[PDB]
Amino acid sequence: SKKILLPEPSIRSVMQKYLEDRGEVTFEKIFSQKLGYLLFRDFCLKHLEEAKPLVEFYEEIKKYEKLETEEERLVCSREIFDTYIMKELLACSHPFSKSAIEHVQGHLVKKQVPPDLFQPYIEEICQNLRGDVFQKFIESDKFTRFCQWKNVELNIHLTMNDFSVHRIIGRGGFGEVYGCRKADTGKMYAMKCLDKKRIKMKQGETLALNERIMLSLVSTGDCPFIVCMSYAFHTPDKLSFILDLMNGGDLHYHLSQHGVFSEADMRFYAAEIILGLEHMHNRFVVYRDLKPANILLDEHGHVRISDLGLACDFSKKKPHASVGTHGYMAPEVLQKGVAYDSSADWFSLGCMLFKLLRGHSPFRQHKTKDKHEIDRMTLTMAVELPDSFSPELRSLLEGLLQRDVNRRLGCLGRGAQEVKESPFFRSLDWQMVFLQKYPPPLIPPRGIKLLDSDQELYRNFPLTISERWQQEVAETVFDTINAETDRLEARKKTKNKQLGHEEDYALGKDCIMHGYMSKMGWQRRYFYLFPNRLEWRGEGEAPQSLLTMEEIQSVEETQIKERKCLLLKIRGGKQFVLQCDSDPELVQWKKELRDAYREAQQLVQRVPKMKNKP
Amino acid sequence: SELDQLRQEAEQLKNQIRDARKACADATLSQITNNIDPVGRIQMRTRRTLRGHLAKIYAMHWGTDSRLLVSASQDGKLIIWDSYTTNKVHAIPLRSSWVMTCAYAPSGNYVACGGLDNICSIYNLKTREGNVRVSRELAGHTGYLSCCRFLDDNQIVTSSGDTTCALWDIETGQQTTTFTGHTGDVMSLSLAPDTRLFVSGACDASAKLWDVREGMCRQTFTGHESDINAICFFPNGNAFATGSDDATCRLFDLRADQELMTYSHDNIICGITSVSFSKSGRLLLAGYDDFNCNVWDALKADRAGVLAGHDNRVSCLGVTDDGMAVATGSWDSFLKIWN
Amino acid sequence: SIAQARKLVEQLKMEANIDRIKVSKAAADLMAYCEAHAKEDPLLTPVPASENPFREKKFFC
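Output (structure tokens, whole complex):
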């Protein structure tokens, strides 16, 4: 089938060690993953009485943060205080500090209720959950379930069969954008394909490479106003970016049909593009290619900034090259050998906003290829504004379009916050712009050369973005699959009682690790690794065969026909092959088998009864 | 310095000891026994194969009923067998994989085992709730458990890689007496019939005679050129045997305070792992790393027979109290009973 | 090592002060023991097969 199936709970033994090795079994790391949180709260809300009112209180605050108006906040702040503070306290059940109580009360009495009013309680809640509570969580099924899910995540190898293509929705110069649905879950995505034959022909590897690296820097944080990536992967012939879907077409196309926009309509797009820019600049990325064609619409008319090919990471070294479309570049950018940063986009924006309002770039006066005239008008003509413009808009454009960086908007002060505080936007509430709640002005209508010294340029290209995958799963199959696999296991538990269940063979000894793998003589058996041997069994028996650590000479990873396996060399000149079900499993058996035998042989060598002699 | 005004004292006292013994050495056992009839060709055969361990067997021990035995294996289990049938009375999964030894208590109520855990763990074979469970974990030693033997249900003597032996009180869970003296890992021990004395064998190449109640080394026997791996009392309690990595067994006498005999042959080059006597003491059975057990004429020093039926080291063996049968344990993972 | 040589001395003091016997007596007595118990040793003096658990014994208790 094409559906998600979780590994059996015994996968814990292997995954738990995999995560501990990487320091991923900590409250912070688990609590801040979507699926870790969801599993952590279920444990707290249903299976531990002391932790219920901490999670309840926490989620009540997180709801409080998102409330939009002050009348709403005044009301909910009181409910939270009566319920989770005065009640617990009167019931002698309030494990929070003296200062914590007085922070909220000192504010509530003065009717001052900002979103972050309860932040001190966030910290102390985490403190109360991070210790004993968190360890009891590690003991439980819910952590086992985290492991089952985490196993799937770390095992993703995406292809084409893992997607269902519907329709084409674009041609690039290197490839073509498609519309698809990921079979796993049902989530709708766009698929940007590129061809390595074309890329090689049109010499744009650095352009292809840059986009993958720049998309990973952008695609954390679930930003509404950037087309973001969940995945990337290779095939022998093509690269794929699985990006957010946008059916609505681009603003260059809609500027064509609709014609120049109202001042109030440009403001909507402006607002949105600005939050898209705030995102990349917070993460030290300058786009450098802001324009109408690079802004996509969804089916409701909301917008996202698109192709990231020409974007730049300025965290370490600031760029000086002239890059971008000629009518929307900043004076810094054009200047040969001069460094710049987030400043470049703010001018570009200024140009794109003027574009939408009047049909052309402020510095373009119907000249097509004569780029130079656009560049000298950018550097001399401080552009001229029609009377028709508003004075609110006049100063925003003037601010954005100052030639000197020491003067312009979003540059000398506080980045995007300075643009948002222009009088042009004074009507707006940027929390609403962010939550995409302002109504959009336009709703779209009805729709031969390849070497091996080139393939290695595209290793490390495959990528999965944890935050992205977990979100997809949480918003689709998660709940039903949890209940489904709960149902299986309870009947597997019920099965074994009648068939004489193994009062588990791993318990009460010194077993290091256990789990399924397959061997040859494939043959799928369950393995138990002990400090001095590796046992295994079929189902319904105890282990009636084994391998000792003493006789293992090496543990190599080796390819068994397009498949990676372990190759234990053995003293007799004998070879033993093992295949796992997932990369984590593999990686952890290689590691644990190597450490076990090296350590075992070190011991036996010390013991005169056990070592071998002449 | 001072030290070499008593290191000479030590090496002067070692000569007086030689002298006293050299003055007792008027004849040899070989000379005294030269007249008696040879034992003839002892040709025993394998009458059972005990099949259950998944890896090397490191130690075996008959129970006093000459019927049940315990065996400790690399697979991390003890198995108690009923040799008359081949059935298993118990499979005991141990907490540590690294077991090296095991012992059966005289009463039949307990077994002991230990290894690189450095712990002698005691197992109650008749719980007042009908199960087999660890009833004590004797911790104290600072090296591995090499051998151990019950005196009764409440006392046990252990030998360790830390160079000491000790008598334990099983309920107290502590060393009631410590036996220090050896300069190398102690590999084996045997209790005298009366259980008043006991002898140990160690990698310092010496065996020592100990007093249980007093906690003192009475006598020290040298002669081996390499580790002693196994040791065993002669049935009357006045002599004992040892097996060593030097390819020899030797017989020592307590009252003569010296070595009576060496059992060896130019063709036997590998080392001895284990030893015991037939019921009368006339035969000395010995296990070897060459995969055989040899049967020696204890009194004449001739090789009477060979037990050849293991495909790896013979790690351990034992003759039943009733003299009926010999058990051999092997690295090949089987025990065989011969007779 | 200072006190270690002293413990070594008074250990040898004991070891050297037991009264011993000649080997001739030692070997005689061993030899005597073997002869006295030879008839009771089934690896020297076979029992009837019907009495041996590992040959032909059929009843067991």
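The domain at 1-339 of chain B is CATH 2.130.10.10 (Methylamine Dehydrogenase; Chain H).
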